[PDB]
């Protein structure tokens, strides 16, 4: 069951049993990391990196090929973003909605969906403060939000 | 959401045996389910089972007789002294002649009758008869 919907969807990605790398994949773990760096430098998220990789370069899971996963490869060298991509995207969506709702006070549905998105943010913020990957001093305020692109 | 995985298991193999199934898939898996089942097996209530290893939590497939009248969880896992264990088997089993409260002691997950002779109480997991 979804967080802020009645939806009981089951559209999950389903990894195979065999964590063992396939045969055909000729790229060594280092050249995969080198290509991950090349994608990160272009300005892509670990989500967008992983998609571009498995599509055009036949690398199912970076964790399967290498040891580690894409953010931890970004983070080790310091190509990772300061605030997480998923909490970035909710703040990005909240600034989009709030801009729409500046000149559309009639749009009561928007206003309700804003409160649902605000709740997704506060909920993730609270999680990342327990894991100290955000400052304890940090708090998403909608007036301070437009600077956080 | 799913919170007591041992509840999902015992209710699913209870539902299944009431229906008359020869075996039943119980599609999350924990070490506590596996110890509980081995206790039900040692007293011959269920048949020799099978733990399917995916690389997540397992799935178990449990051969059934028609001996298991009911298995069940006690949630929450109440603490049971050796004093109190009479009052549980008094109100939670269908007789003194059969039925077994499983309770997780320090010694290990086991029936109430071994918790007597080992002289160790602990937390009631469930029961079966």
């Amino acid at each position: 069951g979804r967080m802020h919907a009645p939806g009981k969807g089951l559209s999950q990605s389903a990894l195979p049993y065999r964590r063992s790398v396939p045969t055909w994949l000729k790229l060594t773990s280092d050249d995969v990391k080198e290509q991950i760096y090349k994608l990160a430098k272009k300005g892509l998220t670990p989500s967008q990196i992983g998609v571009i990789l498995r599509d055009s370069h036949g690398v199912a899971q970076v964790r399967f090929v290498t040891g580690n996963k894409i953010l931890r490869i970004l983070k080790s060298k310091g190509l990772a973003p300061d605030l997480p991509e998923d909490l970035y995207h909710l703040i990005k969506k909240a600034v989009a909605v709030r801009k729409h709702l500046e000149r559309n006070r009639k749009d009561k549905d928007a206003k309700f969906r804003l409160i649902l998105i605000e709740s997704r943010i506060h909920r993730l913020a609270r999680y990342y403060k327990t894991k100290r990957v955000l400052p304890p001093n940090w708090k998403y305020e909608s007036s301070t939000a437009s600077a956080l692109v | 959401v799913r919170m007591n995985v041992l509840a999902d298991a015992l209710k699913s193999i209870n539902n299944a045996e009431k229906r008359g199934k020869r075996q039943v898939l119980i599609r999350p898996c924990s070490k506590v389910i596996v110890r509980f089942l081995t206790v039900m097996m040692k007293h011959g209530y269920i048949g020799e089972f099978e733990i399917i290893d995916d690389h997540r939590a397992g799935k178990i497939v449990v051969n059934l007789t028609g001996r298991l009248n009911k298995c069940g969880v006690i949630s929450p896992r109440f603490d049971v002294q050796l004093k109190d264990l009479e009052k549980w088997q008094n109100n939670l089993l269908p007789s003194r002649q059969f039925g077994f409260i499983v309770l997780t002691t320090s010694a290990g997950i086991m029936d109430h009758e071994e918790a007597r002779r080992k002289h160790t109480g602990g937390k009631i997991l469930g029961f079966f008869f």
């Binding site: 049993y17 599509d55 199912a60 | 399917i52």
Partner: protein, 83 residues
Amino acid sequence: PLAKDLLHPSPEEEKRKHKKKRLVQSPNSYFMDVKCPGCYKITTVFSHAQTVVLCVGCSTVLCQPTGGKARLTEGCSFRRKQH
């Protein structure tokens, strides 16, 4: 039916079922040796691509994204590779 071989699903039954609900979890995707006739190189494309996989040294654009499986452009062939 009361008695079902729950441990031994016949492969007609397993491939029928939802990927998550299979006795062991198993995807419905696969990698393709997609080759265009204009170019020399065999590119590895993911079946459910969801991007525009291009010819590196542009002779064409190979696949186009849809709901499920991507459309392989007319002219292109595919072998499904496995381990």
